[PDB]
Tab-separated table of C-alpha atoms in Angstrom:
chain	number	residue	atom	x	y	z
A	1	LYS	CA	79.966	52.381	145.522
A	2	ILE	CA	77.191	50.088	143.958
A	3	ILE	CA	75.329	47.431	145.821
A	4	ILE	CA	72.183	45.601	144.654
A	5	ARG	CA	69.450	44.060	146.860
A	6	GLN	CA	66.352	42.106	146.189
A	7	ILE	CA	63.269	43.899	145.740
A	8	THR	CA	60.443	44.189	148.508
A	9	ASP	CA	56.932	45.130	148.401
A	10	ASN	CA	57.829	48.483	149.776
A	11	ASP	CA	59.768	49.387	146.328
A	12	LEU	CA	56.684	48.714	144.275
A	13	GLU	CA	55.849	52.357	144.027
A	14	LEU	CA	59.134	53.638	143.208
A	15	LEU	CA	59.673	51.101	140.650
A	16	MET	CA	56.222	51.896	139.051
A	17	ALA	CA	57.366	55.565	138.860
A	18	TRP	CA	60.461	55.018	137.121
A	19	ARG	CA	58.418	52.720	134.717
A	20	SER	CA	55.770	55.249	134.168
A	21	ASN	CA	58.210	58.031	133.044
A	22	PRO	CA	57.792	58.457	129.235
A	23	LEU	CA	61.627	59.537	129.127
A	24	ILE	CA	62.048	55.746	129.819
A	25	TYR	CA	59.288	53.775	128.648
A	26	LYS	CA	60.025	55.142	125.318
A	27	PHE	CA	62.391	52.335	125.340
A	28	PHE	CA	59.946	49.542	126.199
A	29	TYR	CA	58.347	47.298	123.680
A	30	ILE	CA	54.751	48.719	123.097
A	31	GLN	CA	54.378	50.759	126.405
A	32	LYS	CA	52.471	54.021	125.560
A	33	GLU	CA	51.417	55.057	128.721
A	34	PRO	CA	52.271	55.310	132.395
A	35	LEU	CA	51.378	52.143	134.358
A	36	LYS	CA	48.191	51.274	136.400
A	37	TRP	CA	48.612	49.900	139.736
A	38	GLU	CA	46.651	46.722	138.978
A	39	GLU	CA	49.050	45.836	135.933
A	40	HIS	CA	52.122	46.804	137.805
A	41	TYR	CA	50.720	44.605	140.853
A	42	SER	CA	49.631	41.656	138.449
A	43	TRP	CA	53.201	41.927	137.239
A	44	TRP	CA	54.318	41.555	140.666
A	45	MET	CA	52.148	38.669	141.378
A	46	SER	CA	53.049	36.611	138.422
A	47	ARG	CA	56.877	36.708	138.708
A	48	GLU	CA	58.360	33.429	138.056
A	49	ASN	CA	61.854	32.041	137.381
A	50	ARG	CA	63.372	35.493	137.956
A	51	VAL	CA	65.114	37.739	140.363
A	52	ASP	CA	64.754	41.534	140.777
A	53	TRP	CA	67.119	43.680	142.481
A	54	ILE	CA	67.166	47.615	143.468
A	55	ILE	CA	70.380	49.280	142.704
A	56	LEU	CA	71.845	51.300	145.698
A	57	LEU	CA	74.468	54.070	144.934
A	58	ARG	CA	76.686	55.284	147.871
A	59	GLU	CA	77.707	58.743	147.946
A	60	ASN	CA	78.789	61.355	150.535
A	61	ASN	CA	77.592	59.327	153.575
A	62	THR	CA	74.207	58.722	151.608
A	63	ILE	CA	72.797	55.486	150.139
A	64	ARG	CA	69.888	55.842	147.718
A	65	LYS	CA	67.849	53.536	145.478
A	66	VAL	CA	68.835	54.496	141.778
A	67	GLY	CA	67.266	51.599	139.610
A	68	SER	CA	66.524	48.170	139.130
A	69	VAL	CA	68.230	45.163	137.585
A	70	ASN	CA	66.773	41.705	136.997
A	71	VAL	CA	67.220	38.182	135.259
A	72	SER	CA	64.367	36.064	134.108
A	73	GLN	CA	63.977	32.748	132.151
A	74	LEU	CA	66.201	31.342	134.866
A	75	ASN	CA	64.343	27.896	133.997
A	76	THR	CA	66.207	28.140	130.634
A	77	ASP	CA	69.825	27.892	129.618
A	78	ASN	CA	69.925	31.334	128.379
A	79	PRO	CA	68.326	33.846	131.249
A	80	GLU	CA	67.125	37.338	130.256
A	81	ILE	CA	68.868	40.603	131.734
A	82	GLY	CA	67.016	43.720	132.295
A	83	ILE	CA	68.236	46.947	133.467
A	84	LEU	CA	66.776	50.141	134.389
A	85	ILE	CA	68.179	53.159	135.852
A	86	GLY	CA	65.509	55.728	137.186
A	87	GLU	CA	67.819	58.866	137.607
A	88	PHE	CA	67.973	60.412	134.179
A	89	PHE	CA	71.140	62.331	135.038
A	90	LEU	CA	73.062	59.305	136.181
A	91	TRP	CA	72.777	57.891	132.458
A	92	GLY	CA	76.196	57.609	130.842
A	93	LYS	CA	78.067	56.844	134.404
A	94	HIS	CA	78.343	53.310	134.078
A	95	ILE	CA	76.083	52.526	136.990
A	96	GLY	CA	73.911	50.190	134.534
A	97	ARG	CA	77.040	48.372	133.286
A	98	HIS	CA	78.405	47.682	136.664
A	99	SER	CA	75.053	46.284	138.063
A	100	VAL	CA	74.567	43.995	134.932
A	101	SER	CA	77.993	42.651	135.568
A	102	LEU	CA	76.941	41.918	139.289
A	103	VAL	CA	74.267	39.899	137.754
A	104	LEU	CA	76.539	38.262	135.129
A	105	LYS	CA	78.911	37.237	137.743
A	106	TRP	CA	75.973	35.621	139.626
A	107	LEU	CA	74.691	33.808	136.597
A	108	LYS	CA	78.239	32.438	135.864
A	109	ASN	CA	78.851	31.295	139.125
A	110	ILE	CA	75.642	29.453	139.458
A	111	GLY	CA	76.353	27.602	136.373
A	112	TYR	CA	74.803	29.276	133.445
A	113	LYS	CA	76.645	29.411	130.343
A	114	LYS	CA	74.794	32.218	128.203
A	115	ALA	CA	72.864	35.226	128.999
A	116	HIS	CA	70.707	37.751	126.722
A	117	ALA	CA	69.202	40.913	126.586
A	118	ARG	CA	66.170	42.185	124.589
A	119	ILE	CA	66.983	45.724	123.265
A	120	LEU	CA	64.905	48.005	121.146
A	121	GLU	CA	66.478	49.563	118.011
A	122	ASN	CA	66.335	53.079	119.482
A	123	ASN	CA	67.897	52.219	122.759
A	124	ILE	CA	71.280	53.405	122.088
A	125	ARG	CA	72.611	53.550	125.795
A	126	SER	CA	71.420	50.001	126.340
A	127	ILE	CA	72.926	48.621	123.160
A	128	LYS	CA	76.251	50.597	124.228
A	129	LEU	CA	76.007	49.035	127.752
A	130	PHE	CA	75.572	45.519	126.631
A	131	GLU	CA	78.165	45.790	123.907
A	132	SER	CA	80.726	47.088	126.466
A	133	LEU	CA	80.064	43.880	128.306
A	134	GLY	CA	80.911	41.749	125.257
A	135	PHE	CA	77.159	40.963	124.112
A	136	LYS	CA	76.466	40.871	120.415
A	137	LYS	CA	73.511	41.101	118.221
A	138	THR	CA	72.479	37.541	117.305
A	139	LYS	CA	68.670	37.371	116.746
A	140	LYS	CA	65.721	39.449	115.936
A	141	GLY	CA	63.210	39.868	118.733
A	142	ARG	CA	59.721	41.176	118.322
A	143	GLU	CA	59.301	44.320	116.116
A	144	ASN	CA	62.221	46.837	116.181
A	145	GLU	CA	63.671	44.464	119.080
A	146	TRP	CA	66.915	42.709	118.825
A	147	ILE	CA	68.486	39.981	121.007
A	148	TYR	CA	72.008	40.441	122.250
A	149	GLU	CA	73.815	37.659	123.513
A	150	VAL	CA	76.926	36.866	125.764
A	151	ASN	CA	78.852	33.684	126.609
A	152	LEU	CA	79.551	33.596	130.357
B	1	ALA	CA	45.258	62.505	159.447
B	2	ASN	CA	42.745	60.065	157.440
B	3	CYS	CA	39.817	60.235	154.903
B	4	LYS	CA	37.606	57.257	154.112
B	5	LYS	CA	36.153	57.428	150.572
B	6	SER	CA	39.054	52.838	150.288
B	7	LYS	CA	40.659	55.470	152.281
B	8	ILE	CA	43.173	58.356	152.028
B	9	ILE	CA	45.646	58.939	154.856
B	10	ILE	CA	48.532	61.396	155.049
B	11	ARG	CA	51.746	60.750	157.032
B	12	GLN	CA	55.017	62.834	157.274
B	13	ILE	CA	57.660	62.272	154.828
B	14	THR	CA	61.038	60.307	155.510
B	15	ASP	CA	64.412	60.097	153.974
B	16	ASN	CA	63.158	56.932	152.737
B	17	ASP	CA	60.682	58.615	150.435
B	18	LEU	CA	62.942	60.845	148.844
B	19	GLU	CA	63.627	58.820	145.439
B	20	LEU	CA	59.895	58.211	145.028
B	21	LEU	CA	59.151	61.746	145.495
B	22	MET	CA	61.908	62.781	142.890
B	23	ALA	CA	60.590	60.219	140.523
B	24	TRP	CA	57.173	61.540	140.540
B	25	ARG	CA	58.628	65.168	140.001
B	26	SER	CA	61.141	64.096	137.180
B	27	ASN	CA	58.050	62.723	135.250
B	28	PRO	CA	57.491	65.353	132.092
B	29	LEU	CA	53.780	64.396	132.462
B	30	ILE	CA	53.930	66.070	135.787
B	31	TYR	CA	56.500	68.694	135.631
B	32	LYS	CA	54.450	70.159	132.695
B	33	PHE	CA	52.743	71.803	135.462
B	34	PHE	CA	55.625	73.276	137.302
B	35	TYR	CA	57.025	76.874	136.995
B	36	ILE	CA	59.805	76.702	134.199
B	37	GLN	CA	60.868	72.683	134.762
B	38	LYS	CA	61.920	71.670	131.679
B	39	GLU	CA	64.116	68.630	132.674
B	40	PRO	CA	64.097	65.797	135.160
B	41	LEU	CA	65.544	66.836	138.566
B	42	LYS	CA	69.128	65.950	139.648
B	43	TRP	CA	69.683	64.138	142.909
B	44	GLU	CA	71.899	67.059	144.219
B	45	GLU	CA	69.380	69.536	143.655
B	46	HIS	CA	66.712	67.583	145.136
B	47	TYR	CA	68.639	66.673	148.185
B	48	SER	CA	69.731	70.245	148.731
B	49	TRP	CA	65.894	71.076	148.708
B	50	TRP	CA	65.489	68.121	151.399
B	51	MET	CA	68.407	69.814	153.582
B	52	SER	CA	67.086	73.148	153.241
B	53	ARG	CA	63.595	72.693	154.237
B	54	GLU	CA	62.168	75.380	156.521
B	55	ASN	CA	58.563	76.591	157.622
B	56	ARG	CA	56.936	73.626	155.699
B	57	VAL	CA	55.744	70.068	156.234
B	58	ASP	CA	55.597	67.440	153.632
B	59	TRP	CA	53.348	64.353	153.697
B	60	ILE	CA	52.947	61.302	151.507
B	61	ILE	CA	49.371	60.368	150.570
B	62	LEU	CA	48.585	56.804	151.083
B	63	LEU	CA	45.642	54.885	149.408
B	64	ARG	CA	44.188	52.023	151.092
B	65	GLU	CA	42.490	49.666	148.828
B	66	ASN	CA	41.612	46.106	149.608
B	67	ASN	CA	42.614	47.044	152.963
B	68	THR	CA	46.252	47.556	151.771
B	69	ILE	CA	47.958	50.587	151.607
B	70	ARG	CA	50.404	52.228	148.929
B	71	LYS	CA	52.075	55.505	148.266
B	72	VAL	CA	50.377	57.569	145.616
B	73	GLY	CA	51.358	61.200	145.989
B	74	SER	CA	52.619	63.938	148.132
B	75	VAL	CA	50.733	66.856	149.800
B	76	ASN	CA	52.695	69.790	151.524
B	77	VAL	CA	52.401	73.231	153.211
B	78	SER	CA	55.090	75.948	153.225
B	79	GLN	CA	55.217	79.485	154.328
B	80	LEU	CA	53.872	78.546	157.793
B	81	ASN	CA	55.753	81.547	159.320
B	82	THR	CA	53.047	83.721	157.631
B	83	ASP	CA	49.309	83.974	158.136
B	84	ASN	CA	48.557	82.295	154.737
B	85	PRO	CA	50.666	79.300	154.080
B	86	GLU	CA	51.169	77.802	150.664
B	87	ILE	CA	49.544	74.191	149.690
B	88	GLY	CA	51.270	72.117	147.014
B	89	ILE	CA	49.965	68.793	146.021
B	90	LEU	CA	50.924	66.009	143.540
B	91	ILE	CA	49.420	62.741	142.731
B	92	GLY	CA	52.353	60.337	141.340
B	93	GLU	CA	50.025	57.698	139.602
B	94	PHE	CA	48.462	58.795	136.707
B	95	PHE	CA	45.176	56.911	136.384
B	96	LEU	CA	44.093	57.926	139.878
B	97	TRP	CA	43.841	61.631	138.638
B	98	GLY	CA	40.156	62.709	138.637
B	99	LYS	CA	39.319	60.459	141.550
B	100	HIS	CA	39.344	63.021	144.392
B	101	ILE	CA	42.521	61.967	146.208
B	102	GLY	CA	44.000	65.111	145.652
B	103	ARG	CA	40.815	67.009	146.883
B	104	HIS	CA	40.699	64.856	150.040
B	105	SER	CA	44.432	65.352	150.737
B	106	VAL	CA	44.417	69.028	150.556
B	107	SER	CA	41.271	69.153	152.722
B	108	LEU	CA	43.190	67.042	155.464
B	109	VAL	CA	45.748	69.600	155.331
B	110	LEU	CA	43.376	72.380	155.606
B	111	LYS	CA	41.606	70.887	158.645
B	112	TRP	CA	45.212	70.504	160.430
B	113	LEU	CA	45.951	74.181	159.486
B	114	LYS	CA	42.637	75.466	160.720
B	115	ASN	CA	42.824	73.470	164.300
B	116	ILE	CA	46.124	75.108	165.042
B	117	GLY	CA	44.947	78.720	164.135
B	118	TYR	CA	45.542	79.596	160.594
B	119	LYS	CA	42.610	81.469	159.143
B	120	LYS	CA	43.877	81.324	155.400
B	121	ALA	CA	45.790	79.220	152.880
B	122	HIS	CA	46.763	79.639	149.248
B	123	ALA	CA	47.897	77.627	146.202
B	124	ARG	CA	50.032	78.635	143.326
B	125	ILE	CA	48.785	77.182	139.942
B	126	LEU	CA	49.960	77.379	136.347
B	127	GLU	CA	47.049	78.217	134.123
B	128	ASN	CA	47.585	75.069	132.077
B	129	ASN	CA	47.007	73.014	135.216
B	130	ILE	CA	43.188	72.363	134.704
B	131	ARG	CA	42.785	69.405	137.156
B	132	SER	CA	44.649	71.503	139.971
B	133	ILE	CA	42.414	74.448	139.341
B	134	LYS	CA	39.432	72.190	139.624
B	135	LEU	CA	40.684	70.579	142.811
B	136	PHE	CA	41.192	73.759	144.469
B	137	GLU	CA	37.930	75.697	143.417
B	138	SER	CA	35.935	72.320	144.578
B	139	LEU	CA	37.354	73.403	147.874
B	140	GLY	CA	36.458	76.900	147.668
B	141	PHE	CA	39.443	78.457	146.769
B	142	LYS	CA	39.244	81.624	144.708
B	143	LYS	CA	41.683	83.220	142.003
B	144	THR	CA	42.970	86.147	143.842
B	145	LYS	CA	45.932	87.486	142.066
B	146	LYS	CA	48.714	86.897	139.752
B	147	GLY	CA	51.986	84.813	140.618
B	148	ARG	CA	54.750	84.644	138.044
B	149	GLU	CA	54.269	84.499	134.479
B	150	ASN	CA	51.198	82.342	133.547
B	151	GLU	CA	50.756	81.458	137.374
B	152	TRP	CA	47.896	82.385	139.628
B	153	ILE	CA	47.331	82.667	143.377
B	154	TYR	CA	44.018	81.125	144.506
B	155	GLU	CA	43.072	81.697	148.113
B	156	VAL	CA	40.798	80.344	150.730
B	157	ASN	CA	39.436	81.332	154.297
B	158	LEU	CA	39.706	78.419	156.582
């Protein structure tokens, strides 16, 4: 079973360690190095019009932090959805999909009509994930980046 | 145990730290330095390690900066049932490397070992791990003996 809960201060280091793994930041726009704390903290301080959750996976009477899911641009009619699962061997097990659908349901219920994701051309798993939820490539983003959109 | 330099503190690990610890060890930039690891860890392997622990202590390394503390690595001693326990160290944040955090953390562990009556300690280090070699030699460790392939034991008298 999957549950998502809001991020706290305490999760900052775990979030950074996921984002500092090259196996993962190969999929983030222009990131070439692991994160520095001041950049990570500065991101944390400058958060506006967004919600960030930690993904919790329950199995065998254990509950663990497995990734993060977020929406930003909530001051628009088309908020942006981000999804990161930190455990590399959980990929392909629909944890990302289920987590995004939790945020999509929330978005729909609070009145948003659309939502989108920015994805790099090489990020095939993310593409499959969003397309399994009905998103479609509608627009080019920055270089080698594409915007996928859904109707809620 | 704590170590002003900003300040380094070490505190015992907890169930809650497990995912962060796995996240550091699953980074290829780190596991480059680990005997034969070629892949990120799986939770089942990581958690089976955790439920298997004996004759060891693991700490999280805390860095206090602007008077606010954060988790930056892990330091550990194992083989405590012998007269020559093994010390392991890992700094998870990458742009902290080369700032003596690992050195100070290890020396905190050496002081704790000494005070309860150990007289020796060692580290197992891969040949390619130049920062770790410098760390332990800065504390007086001496290359002593081959470990497994491309791996060396470095020992110190406490």
